Subunit: 408 residues, 3 copies
């Protein structure tokens, strides 16, 4: 009764038949190199070159680009007409993308009309808030997923292999195991990253989403080139009245933009630094130069007898996509349906992944049965050009599918 399983990434070893162990805490922002000649314990003349290169920790963040945050000024105007409905007249702020209008229609009165207006219960006083002097101040990105990794290269004799190793995963070969164990608590899913310039940025934990009011972090956004998502103005208008005098609008809510309020208490917010940053559609990768952070590296070497590869198996997998639902750029995510054929084993416990161009976006552990299988993989991230493929290890299907856009 075989119960094949390749979800274990690592090795079985006999401590007596192991020749070298390196165990250390490494600065996350530092590389590490190890070179050694493994010579046979005396009683031979055969040496083996061991060369290990571990690269700096990289962070990869799947994001939704939120566009630009703007600074601006809130202006208030008044438009009065003696007679006629409010829609009968066009107002100065009508061209303003972000405006809030309150109408005082059919409400003219003797002690609130100008001298040329004998109207009672007629016409319109229109109050108008609008944003102007708009200026973009930064680009904002919503964090969907966070993963850290190091590229690990191992030469043992003439064998040479490089792999990108995720934090809390292991590099496995016949003679060398490299495991990385770490934790970082700097960034969280749902955080919003703000980049003010063309070095670093700020983390916002409460960027407005379902309610944006003027004054909030993220209050005035342009998701793309043209078109604002305008904030709410929660305050009230008042029509200030006087005899023989044109009505005057007033607004009693907050008048200070979110950018100004944030900049007035900027020390309340967390900055981060970046090095060698790589923006792609809905993804950002960089190396965090924070030298206070460390991760744990263990390297185990057996010179003569091979490690037992704990995921070794004779099972063979064929893959193709069937369908997809859900969205890229979304915290809710997508589901990729894969048709997976298993041969050479009655059952096989493994993981099927949703990947594109060697980036993984989701994975499902599954016990496959001999023959055809239908496997659903939940994923998050990607962009409109992503074709998510069904993958097993380094092997992927011939095509992938596109997910739908978010925020439709």
């Amino acid at each position: 009764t075989p119960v094949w399983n390749d979800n274990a990434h690592g090795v079985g070893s006999v401590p007596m038949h192991t020749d070298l162990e390196l165990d250390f805490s490494l600065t996350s922002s530092s590389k590490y190199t190890y070179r050694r000649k493994l010579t046979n314990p005396l009683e031979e003349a055969q040496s083996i070159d061991l060369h290990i290169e571990i690269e700096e920790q990289t962070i990869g963040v799947d994001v939704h680009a939120l566009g630009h945050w703007f600074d601006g000024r809130l202006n208030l105007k008044t438009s009065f007409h003696c007679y006629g409905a409010c829609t009968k007249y066009e107002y100065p702020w009508h061209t303003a993308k972000c405006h809030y209008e309150r109408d005082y229609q059919y409400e003219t009165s003797h002690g609130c009309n100008p001298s040329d207006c004998p109207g009672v219960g007629t016409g319109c006083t229109a109050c108008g808030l609008y944003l102007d002097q708009l200026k973009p101040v930064g680009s904002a990105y919503k964090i969907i997923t966070i993963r850290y990794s190091r590229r690990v290269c191992v030469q043992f004799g003439e064998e040479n292999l490089c792999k990108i190793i995720d934090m809390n995963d292991c590099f496995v070969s016949r003679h060398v195991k490299v495991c990385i164990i770490g934790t970082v608590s700097k960034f969280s899913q749902g955080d919003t990253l703000l980049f003010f310039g063309p070095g670093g940025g700020l983390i916002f934990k409460h960027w407005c989403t379902s309610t944006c009011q003027f004054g909030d972090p993220g209050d005035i956004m342009s998701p793309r080139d043209k078109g604002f998502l305008c904030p709410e103005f929660p305050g009230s208008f008042r029509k200030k009245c006087n005899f023989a005098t044109t009505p005057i609008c007033e607004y009693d809510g907050n008048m200070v933009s979110g950018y100004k309020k944030v900049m007035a208490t900027i020390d309340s917010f967390q900055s981060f630094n970046t090095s060698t940053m790589h923006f792609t559609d809905e993804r950002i990768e960089w190396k965090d130069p924070d030298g206070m952070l460390r991760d744990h590296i263990n390297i185990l070497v057996t010179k003569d007898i091979d490690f037992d590869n704990l995921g070794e198996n004779p099972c063979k997998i064929g893959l193709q996509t069937s369908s997809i639902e859900g969205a890229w750029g979304s915290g809710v995510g997508f589901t990729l349906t894969c048709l997976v054929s298993l041969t050479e084993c009655p059952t096989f416990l493994t993981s099927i992944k949703a990947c594109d161009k060697a980036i993984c976006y989701g994975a499902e552990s599954v016990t496959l049965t001999r023959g055809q299988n239908t496997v659903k993989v939940s994923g998050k991230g990607g962009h409109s050009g992503s074709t998510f493929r069904c993958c097993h290890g380094e092997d992927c299907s011939q095509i992938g599918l596109h997910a739908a856009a978010p925020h439709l």
Copy 2:
């Protein structure tokens, strides 16, 4: 001078006298099985069956059930009377559980009265907001504590032992040690989990607590079957006036429910998936099928000579509860006071726990002295039926105590 201590869960070993080590990164949502015949290095005919089963990672979340979130419609009504105080008259919205009333009392005026009202400084115009078309949309739970674990079963020869091993704890036996090391950053204390249907849910990081305004996530709640916690309506009423016309109420605040605002930007929020979910009073357990997450497993085996159990000791403990204060279902928590008797040792460094039905809710490290000790254990979680017992290892007192209800 003995200084006995059982807070260390693990073993002392001599690397030469160890026979097998398995070290690997395991998919959190996958089980793992290892079977091997340990044969004596040649020069014997005695083999030992080793059988290790590691089950999928389970999450256990102590929660406070918040009841149902509702969608609804905000309606506005007006009730006018020529004469009499506002309390003299009953208003249509008085049966509505969530209503906001503003009275314009003794404020009648010539240009704001109907034709049959010669009142000046009399009567009442009543403005009334109320919620209607209410519908529950989901069940919400406040996270109090999060713990991950795997069930680990080890057979070595005829010895067979199963234990639930918390992440970052170790399974210890005479011949086998299994340590699990991991980190997960998906859920946080204070997060609110929302389940919309009877598969998965959403994480909210800003569900309203001390201030709920209409439009907030969590704005309209029913903590149990009947009875709403109504949201605030922060906007203002206006009495629109006209000659020979009944006053008309207006409200200038947000009119869109929190559910609609959240659903309009649903991609801003994080989903999670679940498998084999088990709801009990104030607790939820499930297996997260997110195959992207991994933890580290180390297994060490000595075939001949026993491990040194680092927590081995001759101390003996008797336990009983004395008192309790504080609350279940609460982020502030409770304190269990235990009377603990130590014999066979002058002192003993150990942990006393507050547990019920093999779930732990709190623990206190303490150096006990020979004879009686009073130990206070801080805990969080549980429900009204919980009887928290004083526990040491797998041993517990004969009865437990109930904590008080939260939110009284």
Copy 3:
């Protein structure tokens, strides 16, 4: 081609030439002691005393002290004058530190004047909100950085060395390595800690920063002894009018303080406990007595042949500060510029740190070249009396520089 690197904290070992390994999960709030006589495998009479003391986990939090949070009562007053501008008259609330005034100037009317006021379009009705019955309820601190550590002391023979070991770092010596691996998810950067009394506190994840409205957690603050940061009052005033009657002000916004609203739902918030707490300027250190938390300890001992110290090198470093910019007590932080001289190596990969009085606030990994180097170190934390020095390992420059104050 030498590529010296001391960023790896750990050892190379030959598993056959290692004599003892202790591997265990330790209660975070517990100490651990190991004592053993290492005797030569028989065939000698030379023993070595091994004595290891591991102290309880300490948390060190760099913070910005926010001052005291206050409870208070919101009061509303009215001041009317028949004639003259509003600034012509002094109002009762003018001495109140937190007050909100709305003026109804030149708006007198027949049906809204007292009997002695024949004014039309004159004088002033002044509405005044003010806070009174103020009382401090707690001291608040903004988390800037969080680090955990254990003090580790190792005696091997006559060698005795104590070091404070950060979580996820290693103690390295010729014969003993001690590595600590752990994760904790209780506190987060940007959390606000509130201490109500002189034992424990509460965690707030949404303490108001860029917008404080009355009713918010953190709404009424005094950053120091005298001087309040007053909250906004987002509601509206109304002037209630009547014939031959003095105008009466009304306010329709929230009237309940943030302290009362939080205390009304206190079970929604997370408490923490403390032991042996040490407040210093902009820093708090304590031992968390939460016995449910554990970390992983590995101890490796070689009795005869020394470990290969993976950071061993012949490079020599001289250090001095050059300049500084940025702020203490700030989530944005500071940058220390150091002049670093490298000799005895063509290049050296290492870390330069910004430290004061054996507390580190920042670190930069850098490949130094022979001769002079300019290295910028990003840091966070400290206080006005901090002199941040350039440091390498345990070696620091002769002076340090002060950063600027935050929130100016």
